[PDB]
Each structure stands twice: as C-alpha cells, then as structure tokens.
C-alpha cells in the first residue's frame, strides 16, 4: 500500500553522479526558466550565482526553507519530489571568458524547415528546470531561484507545465499528453547496457557525467487533431490510444509488445505506417540515435479565435545532440506524419553538468 | 489513506447545490468565461447548458465524454473533478431574459483601487473547472470549450493551482503565494448561519438554492511583499505566517484560536492592527457580511521587466453580494493594509443556480 503522504514525503537527491531531473520520475508540475547574465556579470559573478542557486537547490530539495525571509509558500509540505537542474547555453561561454571550454555539443541546432521559433523565448545563457508533485513547492522553488539571480541575471523566458499526478490512476503507468497518446513507453532506462553511453558524457572535463538537454515548446494543433478519426490519429503515431500497444499487435498486445515493422495488411500495406512517429524515431531507424524524453504538457490559454496555446514542453536528454535530437528531428521535420499537427515555437540547447558533490556547487569544475 | 485516493475520490454532480462551492479545495483549476455568439439566443443557450451539463456529469464520474472523447483523461479516476456553471449580467439582455435578471447581478462598484482588464472581466457565462489531476482538469476544460461550438466563444480563461493531496503529512489549511495560511475562517455547512449566508433560499425563483460568485484576479505585488520583514507581513494580515494564529494569540495558539480584537500590547497599541486584513474583513466588522472563499493561486509567467504575473484567483460565494463581497471590498479598498501589496486586475460576478437533479440540466428553470 503506497500512502497518500508519499507524494509530499518523497525526496530526490541533490548530490549525485548526475544532477536530478534527468532520470527522476515524472513530476506533476514543472517550471522551465532561462536567464541571461547582466551587463558586467562575468566569471566571478556567474560563479557566485551558481553557488547561490546550488545552496538554494540543496535546501529546497530537502524541504528546508531558503533562509530567514523564506516566503513560507512551501511551508508544511514535504519535499514533494522537488528537483532543480542547471544548464549552460552556448552564449554563456563568451560572457564569462570560457570560450575554450564551450563544448562542440552546444553548436546551434539546425534551422529546420518546420521551425516557428520565437527567438526571444528561446535559448539563453542559463537554464533551470524545476519540477515537483506539489504546485506550491514548485512555485516556491522557481521564485527562490529567480530571486537568487537578483540583478546579476534576468529572466529571459519562463514556461509552466504539468503532468499526471501521482495516484491519479489505480496503478502507476505511463503518462498521457494532450493529444491523448500514451507518452513515454520507449525511453532508454538506467540499467540498460548502453544507457550511460547514450545519455551521459563519460567520466571538455567540466561536463563529465553531464548531459545535453534540448527543450522545444511544441504547440499541438488540437483544433485540427481532434477532427481526425481514431484510425487517422493512430496512424500518425503507429501505436494505439487505448493502451499504447503497437498497431502491429493483436487484442492481447499491450504497451510492452514489440513493434512489428514488417507486418502488412491483407491488401499488402504496412500496419505501422512508413512515416509513423513511433516508427521513424526509433534508435534502430536512426543509426543508434537516442534520447531520454522527460516532458511536461502546457496550456497557457486561448487566442481570439479560440485556438488553444497548448502542447508539449518537449525535454530530451542525450550525451551528444548529434546522436539524439538533431538527426531524429532532421527526419521528422518533413518526414513525420505528426509534423502536420504540431508547431515548434521555442527551443533551447543546454549543457547540464554532473551533480554537485558534498561541499560543491553545480558547474564548479567549469567556473573554478 | 492510500495514494490512489487522489484519483479515486469523486465529487457529486447531482444535488440541491452545484459542486465547486462547498467542495474541498482542488490542486488544479481553470476558470473560463464565454460570450454568446451572434445567432445564439435563449434556445441556443438552453441547448448549450444541456450539452455542458451532460459533459460535466460524465466527466465528474470518471467517464469519457459522450462522443469525440480525446482520451486525455483516460485511465485516471474522477480525481475530484467538479464543474460549476453561472450566468453574468450581460447574458439576460442577449436571450430575452431581462425580467429574470437578478438584482444581485447589478454591476460591482468601481473601487478606487480597481485596475481591471475589461476584456478579461465579466462575460455572459462562466464555468469553473477543478480537479486534483491536471490531465483530468484539462480534458474537462477542453470538452466544455468544444461543447460551446458555434453557440459561444471563449472571452477569457485563467489557470489556477493549489496544494496537492498528500503534499503535507496530514491535511492542513492551504497557503497562498504570499506564504499565508489562507482559508482558516471559511464558513462550512455544519456551522450556525451557513445556508442563509451562502445560498439563495427555497429574488428570481430560477436561482433557488444557487449562490452568487465574485471572481477577482488579484495580482500579488510579490516584489514589494517579499522585501518586508516577517513582523511587517504579519501586521498586514493580523495572523502569524508559521501557524495562521491570530497575533493576539499566545504560544499555545493555533489558526482556530479565537482572535482578541481589543488586546493591546505593553504600550497600549492593538496587537492585531486596526487595518489588518483578517480584522477588517470579519463578518462582525461588517454588519454580518459574509462569504465562502474558495480560491486558486496563479502564476502565468514573468513580464519583460521580470515582474511575476502571479497572485490569487479569488473566488467567493454568497447569497447576495451586497451582504458579502461588496461591503467588505468597500472597506478594504483603501482601508486594508494588504491593499498596498495587491492589485485587482480582472473581475466577474455570476449567478450560479442550484444543482441539477437526476435527468436535469443546470439552469433549466431559467432557460426552459
Ligand atoms: C508534441 C510533439 C510530440 C508528440 C505528441 C510525441 C508523441 C510521441 C508518442 C506518442 C510516442 C510513442 C510512445 C513512446 O515511446 O513514448 C513517442 C515516441 C518517441 N518520440 Fe515523440 N512526440 C513528439 C515530439 C517528438 C520530437 C520532437 C522528438 C525528437 C526529435 C521525438 C522523439 C520520440 C522518440 C525517440 C520516441 C521513441 C521512439 C522509439 O520507440 O524508440 N518526439 N512520441
Ligand atoms: C490577494 C488577495 C488576498 C489575500 C492574500 C488574502 C489573504 C487572507 C488571509 C491570509 C486570511 C486569513 C486566514 C483566513 O481566515 O482565511 C484572509 C481572510 C479573509 N479574507 Fe482575504 N485575502 C485576499 C483578498 C480578499 C478579498 C478581496 C476579500 C473580500 C472582499 C477577502 C475576504 C476575506 C475574509 C472575509 C476573510 C476571513 C475573515 C474572518 O476571519 O472572518 N480577502 N484573507
């Protein structure tokens, strides 16, 4: 019996080989933020900021207040699986005299033909991912990180997201997105032999045990999507909406049943379409290209014509974007059945170092 | 209490009163207003409320929509979903129902501290959606909005949140983003004068057992608030942040300890300040004016200058605004210590009829 109090009492590790928020389970509430360093903030001011943030992360993740004038917003809650994760944009390095430590992996993402990117709401010197299963715990951490920046950095953009809550379902199971799809079945998992090689930089040296995140604010064209038949929607993905099983499966097939990419109709046509999203994204269709996807859904209102500003805050993790996000998205751009129903409207690519050790701050190897 | 309770708990649709008034607080909220389209009169509004009521009934039972279900809520339990319907002053002129317009919908005063967005205020029709799972809540918002179809457009829509079930080690009163205990003195069904305070009795007959809701989008000036000392913040409310007790209370006092309004300190100054919010808002300071308060917090991001668009979606419930919201806000406008740290930025006043009986729709006695 998992008690209801688990939601609040569950606590994620701040200190680790890897920073939290990568392999951490899905969280109900998410806030992504980018900061740009102030004019005249250099290496010294950035190091001080990262120390402040790391101290704040550490305290909050353990359910402790920030300091004396902590706002009390998270008071009485448990840690609620709070995680805070820090990353560095390509632009950070030129602001701090660290151009020679800028990883080749931060080279800008391609200009994909399907891009519709608000560049103000994209990129940034610094990125912070906050997640928790309690909205006050999450907001408290966002506000404390944002206040820590003070005048030394400014908020460039900031997006809010959500997922299913713990306990929403009778048993824990893969999440859904706002298209109503089972979303998360085929991620690489810790314990798989190639997981570390796929996801983490091995033990420039400041990125040891780090990962590269790609964030994409992807609007779902729900007004078009929701006029489609079940067949049409399922053909876009290649998996069933009911349980996430491959379309190649029978009634007995489940979410775990392997996809049969050769199966055909009586009539000769492939049961899993040739441009289905869950076919064409697989590592075995992309020379081994792989990523961990760990997103939040978003809804930020309606425009004048009733169009919802709703979608997926797509967040993926990889040891090298050129063996993950980039080749896959090159294929998806025009080659994916899903592309017609979505719009990439903001993006970022950030270097996320290893977890801090006792006494350390996140990114200390880089800044020291 | 098992974690699955978050999902399995179910609020009732059918009843003497609509859900979402006395219902416990929920972790996720969507408030939406709609305006009737050209060509939508009384008969089109009745059909709309019939649609909406059927959707609310199904969804509140954890069932899919009756048709074109998106699967977004699939596998989740009801998650304490509630859906609540009301009518604005403007509705009655659009449908030929001017003779049924309650006096209670007469426009709120123009308070000197108002800073209202006219286009995010008011509206013909109001819907309140809340749940403890965000996919359940979004699925209900999207279904209600899609039921509107050609009958009505979305005028405005706001997202809110609260604490999650299980975030605390045992159930406690909510906090808000000012870090205050928020909800202590909310009237409850078993207390002495509750029905007379909150519900139209068995004023136009179609509102029998209904209530009047006042919605205020109140931005919290957190940048100014959070530079105050603890003493200053506690003086603004009249209650302690740590435990919500009256400042007049001793070391043993808790949130429910009765406030002493006459208690002075060693220098003869009142311990609960004369302009403290939790003094001046009490029914006994307002000729018996009272309301149920059942809000959500909001955070919609930052403006270009770093100012959070964050605050309280204040939602209050009363039998008559003239003996609830209106006289209290008249007092608060300039009189309240809190007023300095908030701004009222949107408003709505809606008539929320009684609940639907078995085989009925909400608002039936008005629209048919
Ligand atoms: C809003 C946009 C998107 C939606 C709705 C979506 C939805 C899905 C769904 C339903 C699945 C199948 C179940 C699963 O294995 O998780 C999936 C798998 C996947 N998606 Fe997406 N996706 C989106 C965008 C992206 C993008 C932009 C990328 C990469 C550039 C991506 C990469 C993948 C990968 C790698 C898989 C797993 C492939 C495999 O089976 O091995 N998706 N996606
Ligand atoms: C951002 C805006 C506001 C904040 C932060 C706020 C905060 C609070 C807090 C902390 C309490 C004390 C604990 C409790 O009993 O709930 C309280 C009580 C109350 N507030 Fe507010 N409030 C706000 C706006 C309003 C407005 C606009 C009204 C009515 C016009 C209102 C009416 C009340 C009433 C009636 C009480 C209970 C008084 C009693 O002890 O009988 N508040 N509020």
Numbering used by the authors:
A (entry chain B): 69 to 271, 280 to 444
B (entry chain A): 70 to 271, 279 to 444
What does the paper behind this entry write?
We describe the use of online UV–visible spectroscopy to monitor the X-ray-generated formation of an oxyferrous complex of the dye-decolorizing-type peroxidase A (DtpA) from Streptomyces lividans, allowing its structural characterization. High-resolution crystal structures determined using synchrotron radiation are central to our understanding of haem-protein function. The correct assignment of crystal structures to the correct protein redox and ligand states is essential to avoid the misinterpretation of structural data. This is a particular concern for haem proteins, which can occupy a wide range of redox states and are exquisitely sensitive to becoming reduced by solvated electrons generated from interactions of X-rays with water molecules in the crystal.
Therefore, the observation of this band together with the λmax of the Soret band are strong support for the crystal being in the ferric haem oxidation state. For the present crystal the 0.99 MGy initial structure has two molecules in the crystallo­graphic asymmetric unit, denoted here as A and B, and has been determined to 1.45 Å resolution. Examination of the electron-density maps and structures for the two successive DtpA structures (with accumulated doses of 0.99 and 1.98 MGy, respectively) revealed no substantial differences in coordinates or B factors and no appreciable signs of specific radiation damage beyond the haem pocket. For crystals of DtpA, clear differences were apparent in the spectra of different haem states between room-temperature solution and 100 K structures. The structures allowed the assignment of 100 K spectra to either a diatomic (oxygen) or monatomic (compound III) state, while the spectra allowed X-ray and ligand-soaking effects to be precisely monitored.
